[PDB]
Amino acid sequence: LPDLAEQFAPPDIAPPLLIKLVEAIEKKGLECSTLYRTQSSSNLAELRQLLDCDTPSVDLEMIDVHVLADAFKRYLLDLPNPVIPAAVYSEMISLAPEVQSSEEYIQLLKKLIRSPSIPHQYWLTLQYLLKHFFKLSQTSSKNLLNARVLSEIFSPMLFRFSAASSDNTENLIKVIEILISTEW
């Protein structure tokens, strides 16, 4: 897919294709207790065709919820740079020893992702997703998706954990889990 900085630009709040995917999933899966936890029958290719470029792509409201869910995950995996760029992830790991509390690690993420050499689209995209995840956790009774479960599923795709250690992994999943909860 094109870079997130190429998919949209401020005043616009999120990439057009991601808003479409997210609104269809919310429309059809708010109370689905298997959403994000099952695989649809499609393979990449069927999913990539749908990743809405100048054609194929149908009206996403006609697509099965599980296929939209898989398409959502494929979209995060196919971005040229992940939602949390590798330079950011990298500094989070090496500055970890200088950070004193869980809150300062959360604030470091925010400072780093908003560096002047990281386009505004990265932070805006991260904000749009945190809001979608917060919305889902509000109906957690039903869908079973709490901020923790959602961070465990999506943190590996947002940061693109290649070979992260268990405590760095645990610390970054905690950061995203708390960022979801504070969208209140």
JSON list of C-alpha atoms in Angstrom, two decimals:
[
{"chain": "A", "resi": 1, "resn": "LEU", "atom": "CA", "xyz": [0.00, 0.00, 0.00]},
{"chain": "A", "resi": 2, "resn": "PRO", "atom": "CA", "xyz": [1.23, 3.59, -0.31]},
{"chain": "A", "resi": 3, "resn": "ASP", "atom": "CA", "xyz": [2.79, 5.12, 2.80]},
{"chain": "A", "resi": 4, "resn": "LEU", "atom": "CA", "xyz": [0.35, 6.43, 5.41]},
{"chain": "A", "resi": 5, "resn": "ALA", "atom": "CA", "xyz": [1.74, 9.93, 4.74]},
{"chain": "A", "resi": 6, "resn": "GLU", "atom": "CA", "xyz": [0.71, 9.48, 1.11]},
{"chain": "A", "resi": 7, "resn": "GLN", "atom": "CA", "xyz": [-2.79, 8.09, 1.88]},
{"chain": "A", "resi": 8, "resn": "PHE", "atom": "CA", "xyz": [-4.11, 11.33, 3.41]},
{"chain": "A", "resi": 9, "resn": "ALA", "atom": "CA", "xyz": [-2.98, 14.65, 4.85]},
{"chain": "A", "resi": 10, "resn": "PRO", "atom": "CA", "xyz": [-4.28, 16.93, 7.56]},
{"chain": "A", "resi": 11, "resn": "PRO", "atom": "CA", "xyz": [-7.32, 18.45, 7.97]},
{"chain": "A", "resi": 12, "resn": "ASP", "atom": "CA", "xyz": [-8.19, 14.79, 7.16]},
{"chain": "A", "resi": 13, "resn": "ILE", "atom": "CA", "xyz": [-8.10, 12.64, 10.23]},
{"chain": "A", "resi": 14, "resn": "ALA", "atom": "CA", "xyz": [-7.33, 9.13, 9.03]},
{"chain": "A", "resi": 15, "resn": "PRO", "atom": "CA", "xyz": [-6.63, 7.36, 5.74]},
{"chain": "A", "resi": 16, "resn": "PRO", "atom": "CA", "xyz": [-9.84, 7.09, 3.68]},
{"chain": "A", "resi": 17, "resn": "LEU", "atom": "CA", "xyz": [-9.61, 3.31, 3.26]},
{"chain": "A", "resi": 18, "resn": "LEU", "atom": "CA", "xyz": [-9.13, 2.80, 7.01]},
{"chain": "A", "resi": 19, "resn": "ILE", "atom": "CA", "xyz": [-12.17, 4.93, 7.89]},
{"chain": "A", "resi": 20, "resn": "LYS", "atom": "CA", "xyz": [-14.21, 2.80, 5.45]},
{"chain": "A", "resi": 21, "resn": "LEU", "atom": "CA", "xyz": [-12.95, -0.46, 6.90]},
{"chain": "A", "resi": 22, "resn": "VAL", "atom": "CA", "xyz": [-13.48, 0.67, 10.52]},
{"chain": "A", "resi": 23, "resn": "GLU", "atom": "CA", "xyz": [-17.02, 2.02, 9.97]},
{"chain": "A", "resi": 24, "resn": "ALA", "atom": "CA", "xyz": [-18.15, -1.23, 8.24]},
{"chain": "A", "resi": 25, "resn": "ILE", "atom": "CA", "xyz": [-16.65, -3.37, 10.99]},
{"chain": "A", "resi": 26, "resn": "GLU", "atom": "CA", "xyz": [-18.35, -1.23, 13.69]},
{"chain": "A", "resi": 27, "resn": "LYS", "atom": "CA", "xyz": [-21.63, -1.34, 11.75]},
{"chain": "A", "resi": 28, "resn": "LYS", "atom": "CA", "xyz": [-21.50, -5.13, 11.60]},
{"chain": "A", "resi": 29, "resn": "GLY", "atom": "CA", "xyz": [-19.35, -6.40, 14.44]},
{"chain": "A", "resi": 30, "resn": "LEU", "atom": "CA", "xyz": [-19.76, -4.36, 17.62]},
{"chain": "A", "resi": 31, "resn": "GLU", "atom": "CA", "xyz": [-21.33, -7.34, 19.42]},
{"chain": "A", "resi": 32, "resn": "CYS", "atom": "CA", "xyz": [-19.40, -10.12, 17.69]},
{"chain": "A", "resi": 33, "resn": "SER", "atom": "CA", "xyz": [-17.51, -12.30, 20.15]},
{"chain": "A", "resi": 34, "resn": "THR", "atom": "CA", "xyz": [-15.13, -13.75, 17.58]},
{"chain": "A", "resi": 35, "resn": "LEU", "atom": "CA", "xyz": [-14.20, -10.46, 15.86]},
{"chain": "A", "resi": 36, "resn": "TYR", "atom": "CA", "xyz": [-10.40, -10.16, 15.37]},
{"chain": "A", "resi": 37, "resn": "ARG", "atom": "CA", "xyz": [-9.97, -13.68, 16.74]},
{"chain": "A", "resi": 38, "resn": "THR", "atom": "CA", "xyz": [-10.89, -15.86, 13.74]},
{"chain": "A", "resi": 39, "resn": "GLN", "atom": "CA", "xyz": [-9.54, -16.13, 10.18]},
{"chain": "A", "resi": 40, "resn": "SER", "atom": "CA", "xyz": [-11.99, -15.68, 7.30]},
{"chain": "A", "resi": 41, "resn": "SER", "atom": "CA", "xyz": [-11.72, -18.03, 4.35]},
{"chain": "A", "resi": 42, "resn": "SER", "atom": "CA", "xyz": [-10.04, -15.44, 2.05]},
{"chain": "A", "resi": 43, "resn": "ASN", "atom": "CA", "xyz": [-6.35, -15.52, 1.18]},
{"chain": "A", "resi": 44, "resn": "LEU", "atom": "CA", "xyz": [-4.08, -12.50, 0.55]},
{"chain": "A", "resi": 45, "resn": "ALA", "atom": "CA", "xyz": [-4.90, -11.41, -3.04]},
{"chain": "A", "resi": 46, "resn": "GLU", "atom": "CA", "xyz": [-8.60, -11.81, -2.39]},
{"chain": "A", "resi": 47, "resn": "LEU", "atom": "CA", "xyz": [-7.90, -9.51, 0.64]},
{"chain": "A", "resi": 48, "resn": "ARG", "atom": "CA", "xyz": [-5.41, -7.32, -1.22]},
{"chain": "A", "resi": 49, "resn": "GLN", "atom": "CA", "xyz": [-7.91, -6.72, -4.08]},
{"chain": "A", "resi": 50, "resn": "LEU", "atom": "CA", "xyz": [-10.26, -5.29, -1.56]},
{"chain": "A", "resi": 51, "resn": "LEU", "atom": "CA", "xyz": [-7.48, -3.03, -0.17]},
{"chain": "A", "resi": 52, "resn": "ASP", "atom": "CA", "xyz": [-9.22, -0.31, -2.17]},
{"chain": "A", "resi": 53, "resn": "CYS", "atom": "CA", "xyz": [-7.05, 1.13, -4.87]},
{"chain": "A", "resi": 54, "resn": "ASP", "atom": "CA", "xyz": [-8.40, 2.18, -8.28]},
{"chain": "A", "resi": 55, "resn": "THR", "atom": "CA", "xyz": [-10.46, -1.04, -8.58]},
{"chain": "A", "resi": 56, "resn": "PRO", "atom": "CA", "xyz": [-11.57, -4.21, -7.81]},
{"chain": "A", "resi": 57, "resn": "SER", "atom": "CA", "xyz": [-12.97, -3.41, -4.31]},
{"chain": "A", "resi": 58, "resn": "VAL", "atom": "CA", "xyz": [-16.71, -3.72, -3.61]},
{"chain": "A", "resi": 59, "resn": "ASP", "atom": "CA", "xyz": [-18.85, -1.72, -1.20]},
{"chain": "A", "resi": 60, "resn": "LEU", "atom": "CA", "xyz": [-17.39, -2.84, 2.15]},
{"chain": "A", "resi": 61, "resn": "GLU", "atom": "CA", "xyz": [-20.94, -2.99, 3.69]},
{"chain": "A", "resi": 62, "resn": "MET", "atom": "CA", "xyz": [-21.61, -6.06, 1.49]},
{"chain": "A", "resi": 63, "resn": "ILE", "atom": "CA", "xyz": [-18.57, -7.92, 2.84]},
{"chain": "A", "resi": 64, "resn": "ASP", "atom": "CA", "xyz": [-18.71, -10.55, 5.54]},
{"chain": "A", "resi": 65, "resn": "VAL", "atom": "CA", "xyz": [-17.56, -9.19, 8.93]},
{"chain": "A", "resi": 66, "resn": "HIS", "atom": "CA", "xyz": [-14.73, -11.72, 9.30]},
{"chain": "A", "resi": 67, "resn": "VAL", "atom": "CA", "xyz": [-13.38, -10.86, 5.86]},
{"chain": "A", "resi": 68, "resn": "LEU", "atom": "CA", "xyz": [-13.36, -7.12, 6.78]},
{"chain": "A", "resi": 69, "resn": "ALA", "atom": "CA", "xyz": [-11.51, -8.04, 10.04]},
{"chain": "A", "resi": 70, "resn": "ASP", "atom": "CA", "xyz": [-8.87, -9.95, 8.07]},
{"chain": "A", "resi": 71, "resn": "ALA", "atom": "CA", "xyz": [-8.65, -7.10, 5.58]},
{"chain": "A", "resi": 72, "resn": "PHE", "atom": "CA", "xyz": [-8.16, -4.68, 8.55]},
{"chain": "A", "resi": 73, "resn": "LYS", "atom": "CA", "xyz": [-5.20, -6.78, 9.79]},
{"chain": "A", "resi": 74, "resn": "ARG", "atom": "CA", "xyz": [-3.76, -7.05, 6.26]},
{"chain": "A", "resi": 75, "resn": "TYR", "atom": "CA", "xyz": [-3.91, -3.28, 5.89]},
{"chain": "A", "resi": 76, "resn": "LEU", "atom": "CA", "xyz": [-1.70, -2.81, 9.05]},
{"chain": "A", "resi": 77, "resn": "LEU", "atom": "CA", "xyz": [0.70, -5.53, 7.87]},
{"chain": "A", "resi": 78, "resn": "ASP", "atom": "CA", "xyz": [1.08, -4.16, 4.35]},
{"chain": "A", "resi": 79, "resn": "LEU", "atom": "CA", "xyz": [1.89, -0.53, 5.24]},
{"chain": "A", "resi": 80, "resn": "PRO", "atom": "CA", "xyz": [5.42, 0.30, 4.03]},
{"chain": "A", "resi": 81, "resn": "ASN", "atom": "CA", "xyz": [6.31, 1.68, 7.53]},
{"chain": "A", "resi": 82, "resn": "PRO", "atom": "CA", "xyz": [4.23, 0.38, 10.50]},
{"chain": "A", "resi": 83, "resn": "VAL", "atom": "CA", "xyz": [1.80, 2.64, 12.45]},
{"chain": "A", "resi": 84, "resn": "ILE", "atom": "CA", "xyz": [4.65, 3.12, 15.04]},
{"chain": "A", "resi": 85, "resn": "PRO", "atom": "CA", "xyz": [7.72, 3.60, 12.83]},
{"chain": "A", "resi": 86, "resn": "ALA", "atom": "CA", "xyz": [10.78, 1.43, 13.44]},
{"chain": "A", "resi": 87, "resn": "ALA", "atom": "CA", "xyz": [12.92, 4.45, 14.55]},
{"chain": "A", "resi": 88, "resn": "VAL", "atom": "CA", "xyz": [10.34, 5.19, 17.28]},
{"chain": "A", "resi": 89, "resn": "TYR", "atom": "CA", "xyz": [10.12, 1.57, 18.41]},
{"chain": "A", "resi": 90, "resn": "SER", "atom": "CA", "xyz": [13.88, 1.45, 18.45]},
{"chain": "A", "resi": 91, "resn": "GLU", "atom": "CA", "xyz": [14.24, 4.50, 20.75]},
{"chain": "A", "resi": 92, "resn": "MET", "atom": "CA", "xyz": [11.53, 3.13, 23.04]},
{"chain": "A", "resi": 93, "resn": "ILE", "atom": "CA", "xyz": [13.66, 0.04, 23.58]},
{"chain": "A", "resi": 94, "resn": "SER", "atom": "CA", "xyz": [16.95, 1.83, 24.30]},
{"chain": "A", "resi": 95, "resn": "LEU", "atom": "CA", "xyz": [15.48, 4.73, 26.32]},
{"chain": "A", "resi": 96, "resn": "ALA", "atom": "CA", "xyz": [13.52, 2.23, 28.43]},
{"chain": "A", "resi": 97, "resn": "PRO", "atom": "CA", "xyz": [16.34, 2.05, 31.02]},
{"chain": "A", "resi": 98, "resn": "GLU", "atom": "CA", "xyz": [16.20, 5.89, 31.47]},
{"chain": "A", "resi": 99, "resn": "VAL", "atom": "CA", "xyz": [12.38, 5.93, 32.08]},
{"chain": "A", "resi": 100, "resn": "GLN", "atom": "CA", "xyz": [11.18, 5.98, 35.65]},
{"chain": "A", "resi": 101, "resn": "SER", "atom": "CA", "xyz": [7.49, 5.12, 35.55]},
{"chain": "A", "resi": 102, "resn": "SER", "atom": "CA", "xyz": [4.82, 3.55, 33.40]},
{"chain": "A", "resi": 103, "resn": "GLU", "atom": "CA", "xyz": [3.28, 6.97, 32.73]},
{"chain": "A", "resi": 104, "resn": "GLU", "atom": "CA", "xyz": [6.57, 8.46, 31.49]},
{"chain": "A", "resi": 105, "resn": "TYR", "atom": "CA", "xyz": [6.98, 5.48, 29.10]},
{"chain": "A", "resi": 106, "resn": "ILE", "atom": "CA", "xyz": [3.48, 6.26, 27.72]},
{"chain": "A", "resi": 107, "resn": "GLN", "atom": "CA", "xyz": [4.43, 9.94, 27.36]},
{"chain": "A", "resi": 108, "resn": "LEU", "atom": "CA", "xyz": [7.74, 9.02, 25.65]},
{"chain": "A", "resi": 109, "resn": "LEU", "atom": "CA", "xyz": [5.82, 7.14, 22.95]},
{"chain": "A", "resi": 110, "resn": "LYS", "atom": "CA", "xyz": [3.73, 10.22, 22.29]},
{"chain": "A", "resi": 111, "resn": "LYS", "atom": "CA", "xyz": [6.76, 12.54, 22.20]},
{"chain": "A", "resi": 112, "resn": "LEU", "atom": "CA", "xyz": [8.72, 10.22, 19.90]},
{"chain": "A", "resi": 113, "resn": "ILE", "atom": "CA", "xyz": [5.89, 9.50, 17.39]},
{"chain": "A", "resi": 114, "resn": "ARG", "atom": "CA", "xyz": [5.28, 13.24, 17.17]},
{"chain": "A", "resi": 115, "resn": "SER", "atom": "CA", "xyz": [8.97, 13.99, 16.34]},
{"chain": "A", "resi": 116, "resn": "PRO", "atom": "CA", "xyz": [9.26, 16.61, 13.53]},
{"chain": "A", "resi": 117, "resn": "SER", "atom": "CA", "xyz": [10.70, 14.00, 11.10]},
{"chain": "A", "resi": 118, "resn": "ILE", "atom": "CA", "xyz": [7.68, 11.69, 11.54]},
{"chain": "A", "resi": 119, "resn": "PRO", "atom": "CA", "xyz": [4.73, 12.92, 9.43]},
{"chain": "A", "resi": 120, "resn": "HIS", "atom": "CA", "xyz": [1.56, 13.89, 11.33]},
{"chain": "A", "resi": 121, "resn": "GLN", "atom": "CA", "xyz": [-0.35, 11.05, 9.58]},
{"chain": "A", "resi": 122, "resn": "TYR", "atom": "CA", "xyz": [1.36, 8.45, 11.83]},
{"chain": "A", "resi": 123, "resn": "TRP", "atom": "CA", "xyz": [0.05, 9.96, 15.08]},
{"chain": "A", "resi": 124, "resn": "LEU", "atom": "CA", "xyz": [-3.42, 10.73, 13.61]},
{"chain": "A", "resi": 125, "resn": "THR", "atom": "CA", "xyz": [-3.67, 7.13, 12.37]},
{"chain": "A", "resi": 126, "resn": "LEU", "atom": "CA", "xyz": [-2.63, 5.82, 15.77]},
{"chain": "A", "resi": 127, "resn": "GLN", "atom": "CA", "xyz": [-5.30, 8.08, 17.40]},
{"chain": "A", "resi": 128, "resn": "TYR", "atom": "CA", "xyz": [-8.02, 6.86, 15.01]},
{"chain": "A", "resi": 129, "resn": "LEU", "atom": "CA", "xyz": [-7.28, 3.23, 15.86]},
{"chain": "A", "resi": 130, "resn": "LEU", "atom": "CA", "xyz": [-7.08, 3.80, 19.64]},
{"chain": "A", "resi": 131, "resn": "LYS", "atom": "CA", "xyz": [-10.61, 5.33, 19.41]},
{"chain": "A", "resi": 132, "resn": "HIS", "atom": "CA", "xyz": [-11.93, 2.30, 17.45]},
{"chain": "A", "resi": 133, "resn": "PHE", "atom": "CA", "xyz": [-10.45, -0.07, 20.04]},
{"chain": "A", "resi": 134, "resn": "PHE", "atom": "CA", "xyz": [-11.89, 2.07, 22.87]},
{"chain": "A", "resi": 135, "resn": "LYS", "atom": "CA", "xyz": [-15.32, 1.89, 21.20]},
{"chain": "A", "resi": 136, "resn": "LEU", "atom": "CA", "xyz": [-15.04, -1.90, 20.99]},
{"chain": "A", "resi": 137, "resn": "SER", "atom": "CA", "xyz": [-14.03, -2.32, 24.66]},
{"chain": "A", "resi": 138, "resn": "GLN", "atom": "CA", "xyz": [-17.19, -0.38, 25.64]},
{"chain": "A", "resi": 139, "resn": "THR", "atom": "CA", "xyz": [-19.24, -3.44, 24.45]},
{"chain": "A", "resi": 140, "resn": "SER", "atom": "CA", "xyz": [-16.77, -5.90, 25.89]},
{"chain": "A", "resi": 141, "resn": "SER", "atom": "CA", "xyz": [-19.52, -7.67, 27.82]},
{"chain": "A", "resi": 142, "resn": "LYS", "atom": "CA", "xyz": [-20.70, -8.87, 24.42]},
{"chain": "A", "resi": 143, "resn": "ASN", "atom": "CA", "xyz": [-17.75, -8.89, 22.01]},
{"chain": "A", "resi": 144, "resn": "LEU", "atom": "CA", "xyz": [-15.31, -9.93, 24.78]},
{"chain": "A", "resi": 145, "resn": "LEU", "atom": "CA", "xyz": [-12.72, -7.38, 23.56]},
{"chain": "A", "resi": 146, "resn": "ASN", "atom": "CA", "xyz": [-11.20, -5.48, 26.50]},
{"chain": "A", "resi": 147, "resn": "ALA", "atom": "CA", "xyz": [-8.28, -3.01, 26.11]},
{"chain": "A", "resi": 148, "resn": "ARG", "atom": "CA", "xyz": [-5.87, -5.72, 27.09]},
{"chain": "A", "resi": 149, "resn": "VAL", "atom": "CA", "xyz": [-7.00, -8.34, 24.61]},
{"chain": "A", "resi": 150, "resn": "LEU", "atom": "CA", "xyz": [-7.06, -5.70, 21.85]},
{"chain": "A", "resi": 151, "resn": "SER", "atom": "CA", "xyz": [-3.51, -4.56, 22.71]},
{"chain": "A", "resi": 152, "resn": "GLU", "atom": "CA", "xyz": [-2.27, -8.18, 22.73]},
{"chain": "A", "resi": 153, "resn": "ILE", "atom": "CA", "xyz": [-3.75, -8.72, 19.23]},
{"chain": "A", "resi": 154, "resn": "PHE", "atom": "CA", "xyz": [-2.80, -5.43, 17.58]},
{"chain": "A", "resi": 155, "resn": "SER", "atom": "CA", "xyz": [0.41, -4.32, 19.30]},
{"chain": "A", "resi": 156, "resn": "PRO", "atom": "CA", "xyz": [2.52, -6.81, 17.28]},
{"chain": "A", "resi": 157, "resn": "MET", "atom": "CA", "xyz": [1.13, -5.24, 14.02]},
{"chain": "A", "resi": 158, "resn": "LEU", "atom": "CA", "xyz": [1.36, -1.59, 15.08]},
{"chain": "A", "resi": 159, "resn": "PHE", "atom": "CA", "xyz": [4.99, -1.84, 16.14]},
{"chain": "A", "resi": 160, "resn": "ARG", "atom": "CA", "xyz": [5.90, -4.77, 13.89]},
{"chain": "A", "resi": 161, "resn": "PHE", "atom": "CA", "xyz": [7.65, -6.67, 16.62]},
{"chain": "A", "resi": 162, "resn": "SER", "atom": "CA", "xyz": [10.40, -8.46, 14.70]},
{"chain": "A", "resi": 163, "resn": "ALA", "atom": "CA", "xyz": [12.48, -9.94, 17.53]},
{"chain": "A", "resi": 164, "resn": "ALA", "atom": "CA", "xyz": [11.45, -8.09, 20.69]},
{"chain": "A", "resi": 165, "resn": "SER", "atom": "CA", "xyz": [12.19, -9.49, 24.16]},
{"chain": "A", "resi": 166, "resn": "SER", "atom": "CA", "xyz": [9.39, -10.62, 26.46]},
{"chain": "A", "resi": 167, "resn": "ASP", "atom": "CA", "xyz": [9.66, -7.69, 28.91]},
{"chain": "A", "resi": 168, "resn": "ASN", "atom": "CA", "xyz": [10.04, -5.11, 26.14]},
{"chain": "A", "resi": 169, "resn": "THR", "atom": "CA", "xyz": [7.09, -6.84, 24.43]},
{"chain": "A", "resi": 170, "resn": "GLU", "atom": "CA", "xyz": [5.12, -6.79, 27.70]},
{"chain": "A", "resi": 171, "resn": "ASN", "atom": "CA", "xyz": [5.95, -3.14, 28.27]},
{"chain": "A", "resi": 172, "resn": "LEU", "atom": "CA", "xyz": [4.84, -2.02, 24.85]},
{"chain": "A", "resi": 173, "resn": "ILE", "atom": "CA", "xyz": [1.59, -4.01, 25.03]},
{"chain": "A", "resi": 174, "resn": "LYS", "atom": "CA", "xyz": [0.92, -2.26, 28.40]},
{"chain": "A", "resi": 175, "resn": "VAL", "atom": "CA", "xyz": [1.51, 1.18, 26.85]},
{"chain": "A", "resi": 176, "resn": "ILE", "atom": "CA", "xyz": [-1.06, 0.52, 24.06]},
{"chain": "A", "resi": 177, "resn": "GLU", "atom": "CA", "xyz": [-3.53, -1.13, 26.49]},
{"chain": "A", "resi": 178, "resn": "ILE", "atom": "CA", "xyz": [-3.48, 1.99, 28.72]},
{"chain": "A", "resi": 179, "resn": "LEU", "atom": "CA", "xyz": [-3.63, 4.37, 25.74]},
{"chain": "A", "resi": 180, "resn": "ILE", "atom": "CA", "xyz": [-6.86, 2.63, 24.66]},
{"chain": "A", "resi": 181, "resn": "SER", "atom": "CA", "xyz": [-8.43, 2.96, 28.16]},
{"chain": "A", "resi": 182, "resn": "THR", "atom": "CA", "xyz": [-7.70, 6.70, 28.35]},
{"chain": "A", "resi": 183, "resn": "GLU", "atom": "CA", "xyz": [-9.73, 7.49, 25.25]},
{"chain": "A", "resi": 184, "resn": "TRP", "atom": "CA", "xyz": [-12.65, 7.82, 27.79]}
]
